Amino acid sequence: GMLPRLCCLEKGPNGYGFHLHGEKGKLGQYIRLVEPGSPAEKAGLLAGDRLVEVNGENVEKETHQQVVSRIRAALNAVRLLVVDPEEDSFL
Ligand SMILES: [Cl-]
Ligand SMILES: [Cl-]
Structure with missing residues (x-):
């Protein structure tokens, strides 16, 4: 709805199943x-x-x-509280 998507994952045998990564300059x-x-x-x-x-x-x-x-x-x-970067910005 209005709230950012909240993703609650249970750790499985093979970890969580996703990568996390940054981007040079843009923290x-x-x-x-x-x-x-x-x-x-x-x-x-x-x-x-x-x-x-x-x-x-x-x-x-x-x-x-x-x-x-x-x-x-x-x-x-x-x-994990996530937002879609094309729709959300921090100020
Ligand atoms: Cl990807
Ligand atoms: Cl969002």
């Missing part, structure tokens, strides 16, 4: 390569999505390493 992390049939795909993630929060914490301006660390440390699940 920020983005979903990339979502595997068919994975938690990521089941939870609604889409390559192209920008990652705003991981488990209720703002990671919009955090390094690639910080964000991956956070995602990786959670135990069973991660809630």
Whole structure:
């Protein structure tokens, strides 16, 4: 609706099933390569999505390493708050 899409994935045997990546100069992390049939795909993630929060914490301006660390440390699940970058901007 109005709220950013919230994607709640349960960690599977083969991880979550998606890549995360930044872009030189333009800080920020983005979903990339979502595997068919994975938690990521089941939870609604889409390559192209920008990652705003991981488990209720703002990671919009955090390094690639910080964000991956956070995602990786959670135990069973991660809630990923994403927006479509063509429709959302931070000010
Ligand atoms: Cl991709
Ligand atoms: Cl959005």
